[PDB]
Amino acid sequence: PLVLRHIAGLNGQMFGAMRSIPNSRGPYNIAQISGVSVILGNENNLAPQFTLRGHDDVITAFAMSHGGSMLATGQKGSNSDVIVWDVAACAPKYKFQEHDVEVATVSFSADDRLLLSASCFTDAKLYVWDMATGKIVAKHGLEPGKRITCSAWSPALANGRAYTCATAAGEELALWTVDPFTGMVSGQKVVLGTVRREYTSLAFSADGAWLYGGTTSADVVTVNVQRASVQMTHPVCSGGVGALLLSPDGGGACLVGGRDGSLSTFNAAGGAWRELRPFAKVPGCVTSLSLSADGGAFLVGTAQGGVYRLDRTSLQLHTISQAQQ
Amino acid sequence: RRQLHTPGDADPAKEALLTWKPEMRVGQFVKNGGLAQENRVRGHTLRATAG
Amino acid sequence: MREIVHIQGGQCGNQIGAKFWEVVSDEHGIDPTGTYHGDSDLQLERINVYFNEATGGRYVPRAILMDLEPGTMDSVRSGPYGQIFRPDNFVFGQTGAGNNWAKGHYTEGAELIDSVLDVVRKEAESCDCLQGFQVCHSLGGGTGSGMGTLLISKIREEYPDRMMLTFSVVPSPKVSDTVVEPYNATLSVHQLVENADECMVLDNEALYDICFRTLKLTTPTFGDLNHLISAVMSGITCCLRFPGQLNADLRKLAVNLIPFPRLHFFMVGFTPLTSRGSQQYRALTVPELTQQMWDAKNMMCAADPRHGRYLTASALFRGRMSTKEVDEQMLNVQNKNSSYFVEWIPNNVKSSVCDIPPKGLKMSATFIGNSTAIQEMFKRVSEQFTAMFRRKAFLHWYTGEGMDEMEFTEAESNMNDLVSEYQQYQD
Ligand SMILES: Nc1nc2c(ncn2[C@@H]2O[C@H](COP(=O)(O)OP(=O)(O)O)[C@@H](O)[C@H]2O)c(=O)[nH]1
């Protein structure tokens, strides 16, 4: 064979294509989405590792566990399947080939037990999987000819399993309750009064009673899940909220990344009048945001192929790897 | 005489008048499937007066 | 150096314009905030036409939103692309016209038509050279009809040499939504004849035919009708915003279409409408676009073009095309069907080519047609009026705010003259 030097490339079209494993003790720290495979590598000193090949066609759905032990990835082609890799050994632990046309979204639960792979638009067969075995848990029929942008799960649990939420391509936002009792999923559409924005990235709060969805309209739509309703919207940043991730401080804060490369802090319990402090700047159009390790660094991924490390106390910019589109 | 705080200064928008801060923003709110609308401390009188 | 001021009126006008500003903003790369993020340099060449430059690089539209009910001003800013609009331009009433043409035009206009003129005067002064004004409203209700025509009456007396684009929906043949719809249209078309320099005719039930048969949407959203209208309203000004092989402004479209001043009502179609299940199999060519252009069902009007001859037509082509292919295709449709075109006007179809296609399509065309077939629509509205007016049904409301029955009789004076003046060229 031939020795391989540093490999670069990330798919800037899809949201959240660069995310960091929260445990940095291993040789892998960062995961980025290419066309046919993924790249697992380290953050600081560029010594790349194995590209987990094994997909027949182009990748269009990415997820990783909050514990950092599992990764999940789908593909768009005719032989559509979603596969879950392990990170301890570079091997596909799970394969699921039941979606016909393409994968829409893939997400993990708050704990590493549950998978949501509501992924099609022709047949639209919503799946909820478990990580103990490679078998189905919940089954649903979504909608003919509807696209799902992003989905997430709540940290609020009852009887050991969580409840998820997903955004359609249009206005609607569906909340799903999944149970271990019989595997019957219950869905409800949120009562959007007049807020009809295209949802870019959603994530629940710490308590789980609220979910924040940053939209293309540069505002965060807040949804209370006990009433299944929209409460308020707050405009953050001078660009649409490409990435949204809850702040690690412990309060009601949430880090967001705008279309103009501004990483700002959004407080849930705040006044109607807000002042948009930029809170440092990123040169590229930020689409992905993650927390790298215990050092307090946020890894931000841009649509221009740039990955940047931004530490806290103090705030410095350090570009990592660029890539042409 | 006894000094008392002026009650009219509680408005957040009045904390810096006659300053050009373009990054100040306005929030909105939704009331259980009702019409989403601008959030002010007294927006009703600004909208449709009274009487 | 040419600019267009946009005014939206009523429930229908606000939602059409919001979907219009949804589409026209993305093709210039402006996000919902106002910051430019497009990937092409030609998008920033003509931003002045529909956007005003502000501090920090934000672009604010030249849009004036008017209504008599405050609910719609929640409906615009809380939807997508709702934060671009200037909050000073959010001028509104408190009570709502309530589908009364008299309330919009006589009583509730007088406290608000002064306020909406101050916004328009401010926006016209900030411009350097107005190409024209563009309004979108409804002829069925009262807010966009009575107050909408009131602004048009009061803006032509101030700016008489500027063009006036009206995108007005009309009552429908098959199924309707408001009971007094023939009353509101006949009064509004009576005003729209003398002041509006050019008029575009829309109706929802022609779009229902387009959405269900051509686009084959199983359950089309109420905004999916608006996207057909929004693609048109971007297509009329497509030559203004971008360079092209054949330059044709709003004036050249105007001076080529109308032979006489009173025949300014046009019926409009949009060509590249294909369902998503067959978009792979369709080859988008100039013969493909022209064949779908002249189809009766592709028109956005209830008037069948087969009934009445095409007096004058115009086509606005977008994309990379050949001038010889476009010109020889327009001569083909005239020679193949010469009975459907008027005889004393040679070279009926005037075509324009723009080299910047819309987003997601490599080729597109918007069709404008001035024909005498549209007299079937106005007679159908008029025959609904004479059934109700002869017994003075639903007339005590309209005379409540001040107008007399004489203005109702004068409404059919110009309506029946309009359909008779259309009729004299069909024979
Ligand atoms: N195509 C389209 N038609 C609309 C829209 N909104 C309202 N309409 C039509 O407008 C008609 C009534 O208009 P209306 O609400 O009474 O206008 P207003 O009361 O004067 O503001 C109805 O028949 C609707 O079909 C829209 O967003 N798109």
The phi, psi pair for C203, rounded to 5°, reads -155, 145
Q: C365 - beta bridge partners?
A: C317
Separation of CA C134 and ligand 1 centre (Å):
18
Burial class of residue A23 (count of CB atoms within 10 Å of its CB; 0-12, 13-18, 19+): middle
Cβ neighbours for C177, distance < 8 A, ≥ 6 positions apart: C140
E strands in C229-387 = 265-270, 310-319, 349-354, 363-371
Distance CA C153, CA C150 (A): 5
CB–CB of B47 and C70 under 8 A?
Answer: yes
Contact residues, chain B, for C74 at CB < 8 Å: 35-37
Calpha distance C136→C138 (Å, rounded): 7
Per-residue tokens: A96:
């699921």
- Residues with Cβ within 8 Å of C346's Cβ and at least 6 positions away in sequence, in order, are none
State how far the Cα of C178 lies from the Cα of C394, in Å rounded to an integer: 12
By CA distance, what is B21's nearest residue in A?
A275
Cα C229 to ligand 1 centre (Å): 13
Q: What DSSP designation does C357 have?
A: P
Please, which experimental method was used?
Answer: cryo-EM
Q: Which residues pair with C30 in a beta bridge?
A: C36
Q: For residue C55, count CB atoms less than 10 angstroms from its CB and return exposed for 0-12, middle for 13-18, buried for 19 or more.
A: exposed
Helix or strand or coil: residue C72?
Answer: helix
Closest in B22, B28, B48 to C94, CB measured: B48
Q: What is the radius of gyration, based on Cα positions, of chain B?
A: 15
Pocket test for ligand 1, best of C12, C183, C224 (most atoms within 8 A of CB): C12
Pairwise CA distance, residues C140 & A299, whole Å:
55
Residue A229 and residue B40: Cβ atoms within 8 Å?
no
Give the nearest partner residue to C80 out of A198, A233, A259, using CB atoms: A198
Strands (DSSP E) contained in A124-273 are: 125-130, 136-141, 148-158, 161-168, 173-177, 186-189, 199-204, 210-215, 219-224, 229-235, 243-246, 253-257, 263-267
Chain B environment of C55 (Cβ under 8 Å): 22
Query: DSSP per residue over B13-48, as a string?
Result: GGGG-S---TTEE--EE--TTS--EE--TTHHHHHH
* Gyration radius of chain A over CA positions: 19
The minimum CA-CA distance between A267 and chain B, rounded to whole Å, is 12
- The residue whose CA is least distant from atom 10 of ligand 1 is C12
Residue C392 half-sphere exposure, CB side, CA atoms within 13 Å?
6
User: Which residues of C fall in the annotated binding site?
Assistant: 11, 69, 138, 142-144, 204, 226
Q: Are A64 and A71 within 8 A, CB to CB?
A: yes
* A25 dihedral zone (left: phi>0; alpha: psi -120 to 50; beta): alpha
Is B17 touching A (CB cutoff 8 A)? no
Determine how β-strand A229-235 pairs with β-strand B28-29.
Answer: antiparallel
CB-based contact (8 Å) between C275 and chain A? Answer: no
Question: CB count, 10 Å around CB of C174?
Answer: 11
Q: Apex CA A232: angle with CA A229 and CA A237, to 5°?
A: 130
Contacts of C213 (CB under 8 A, 6+ apart): C297
A32 by DSSP, 3-state: which?
strand
User: Phi, psi (5° rounding) for residue C206?
Assistant: -75, -35
Distance between the two ends of chain B, CA-based, in angstroms? 37
Whether the Cβ atoms of residue A116 and residue A107 lie closer than 8 Å to each other: yes
* Tokens 């499937």 sit on residue: B33
* Cβ within 8 Å, pair C74-B37: yes
- Write out the two tokens for A127: 């799946």
Minimum CA–CA partner of C74 in chain B: B37
Show Cβ contacts of residue A133 under 8 Å, excluding neighbours closer than 6 positions: none
Strands C130-138, C3-9: pairing kind: parallel
Q: What's the DSSP call for residue C400? A: G
